[PDB]
């Protein structure tokens, strides 16, 4: 994405009941900080989840080390909180390159001033001025009104943790429910007229794959005619009907 | 080297103007609080402005759109220039660095003081 | 023009307690806890004593203390020397990012 928001000012979306490799980012390996918590990076896209919410934002590259379930800091007490198991990855990597200009890419900016902390996956987005002791302001910016949002600088010529990081939070839950996203998954071709395994869409066996001649109903996929003799089955592939022997 | 340098004060007409020049030393300009006060000499304290860290200006009753506050980031100097002067200007013109969190010795809580001091100008405003 | 008010001359003997007030308005002083008070030698600059009403500085002498009741302010000062006759004043934060300075109070030391 060319826009991104700010770390207080990150926006919440939904990808549901569709296709999505995960690991097909390894060989791209546009990456500076890949890492996932609390669950093994592989099989993301074998196994699957449901609430696939989606988060993306700017971050400083030196606050990088903030991003940890449970740790603190300018990001998960004032800007963006992920909690005690974080479900989810978090992997990031530069972006001086693109969202970033000469002169200071001044438009991105970061909350630091509130009085407590932050929740699981809050959007901590307010127009609260600060206090630290018991008298606030009366509107004009002096000792203790604390607009909390300071400007972020990126210039072209700052140092390794002064430049933009693109990064994303991935948003997870578990809740027993219809399931959403998994990665696309393996279609090996097929064999014919030989003693083989299969496996198709859940249900599976073991014998010959060989053609038929009975026609099927438009939302067909596998027909027993006596005593759960599984063995006409329809391809999901070529949506053409086979029989099991 | 905590100093502040205040001077270029002199002659100047009423209906004309002066240019100050606080040399802040000890810190910068760039990244701290800063104000001016005028006082006739053992009179009373009289403030007169508050450009911020960032170039805020900020000025008081009287001298609202009279005295014109100005900095240079790396030279770090404070100007006070001065229009529509006025009789009741007889006044040796302290430049002050005001304390807030930006300023280095409060943590928590509210700042608000002026601890580096200088010696004051003459600007002495007469027919 | 714009001043905080003050009585002009306090007094009192070496080794006791005084209380300067710093009276001001519903702007400066009933709203925001910055009466900060500076210690002004005749021909000199102001030094710094007091500021952030209730907590004390680093190293500075204890002998001056301010306190802060509403519109009316105080400097609890206690136990006086010999160097505490200059022009003392209050400071306070007067509202919409604005400064006032206090009418001075020349404390005469006896003995």
């Known amino acids: 994405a060319t826009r991104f928001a700010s770390v207080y000012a990150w926006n919440r979306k939904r990808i549901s009941n569709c296709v999505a490799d995960y690991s097909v980012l390894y060989n791209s390996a546009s990456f500076s900080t890949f890492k996932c918590y609390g669950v093994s990076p592989t099989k993301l896209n074998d196994l699957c989840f449901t609430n696939v919410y989606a988060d993306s934002f700017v971050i400083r590259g030196d606050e990088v080390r903030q991003i940890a379930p449970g740790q603190t800091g300018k990001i998960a007490d004032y800007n963006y909180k992920l909690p005690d198991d974080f479900t989810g990855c978090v992997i990031a990597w530069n972006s001086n390159n693109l969202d970033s200009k000469v002169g200071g890419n001044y438009n991105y900016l970061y909350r630091l001033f509130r009085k407590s902390n932050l929740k699981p996956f809050e959007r901590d987005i307010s127009t609260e001025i600060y206090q630290a002791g018991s008298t606030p302001c009366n509107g004009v910016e002096g000792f203790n009104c604390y607009f909390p949002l300071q400007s972020y600088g990126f210039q072209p010529t700052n140092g390794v943790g002064y430049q933009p990081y693109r990064v994303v939070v991935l948003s997870f839950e578990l809740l027993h429910a219809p399931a959403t996203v998994c990665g696309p998954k393996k279609s090996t071709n097929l064999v014919k007229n030989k003693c083989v395994n299969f496996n198709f869409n859940g249900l599976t066996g073991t014998g010959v794959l060989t053609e038929s001649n009975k026609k099927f109903l438009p939302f067909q996929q596998f027909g027993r005619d006596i005593a759960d003799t599984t063995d006409a089955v329809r391809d999901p592939q070529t949506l053409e009907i086979l029989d099991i022997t | 080297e905590v100093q502040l340098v205040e001077s270029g004060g002199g002659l100047v007409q009423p209906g004309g103007s002066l240019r100050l020049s606080c040399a802040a030393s000890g810190f910068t300009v760039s990244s701290n609080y800063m104000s001016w006060v005028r006082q006739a000499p053992g009179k009373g304290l009289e403030w007169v402005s508050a450009?911020?860290?960032?170039?805020?200006?900020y000025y008081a009753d009287s001298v609202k759109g009279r005295f014109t506050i100005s900095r240079h980031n790396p030279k770090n100097t404070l100007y006070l220039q001065m229009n529509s002067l006025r009789a009741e200007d007889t006044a040796v013109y302290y430049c002050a660095r005001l304390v807030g969190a930006l300023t280095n010795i409060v943590v928590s809580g509210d700042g608000g003081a002026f601890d580096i001091w200088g010696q004051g100008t003459m600007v002495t405003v007469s027919s | 023009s714009y001043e905080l008010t003050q009585p002009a001359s306090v007094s009192g003997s070496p080794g006791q307690s005084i209380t300067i007030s710093c009276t001001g308005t519903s702007s400066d002083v009933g709203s925001y806890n910055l009466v900060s008070w500076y210690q002004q030698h005749p021909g000199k600059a102001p030094k710094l004593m007091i500021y952030?009403?209730?907590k004390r500085p680093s190293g500075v002498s204890n002998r001056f203390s301010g306190s802060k009741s509403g519109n009316t302010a105080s400097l609890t000062i206690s136990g006086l020397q010999a160097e505490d006759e200059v022009d003392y004043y209050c400071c306070s934060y007067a509202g919409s990012s604005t400064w006032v300075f206090g009418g001075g109070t020349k404390l005469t030391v006896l003995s």
């Open positions: 952030e009403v209730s």
């Open positions: 450009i911020y860290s960032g170039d805020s200006t």
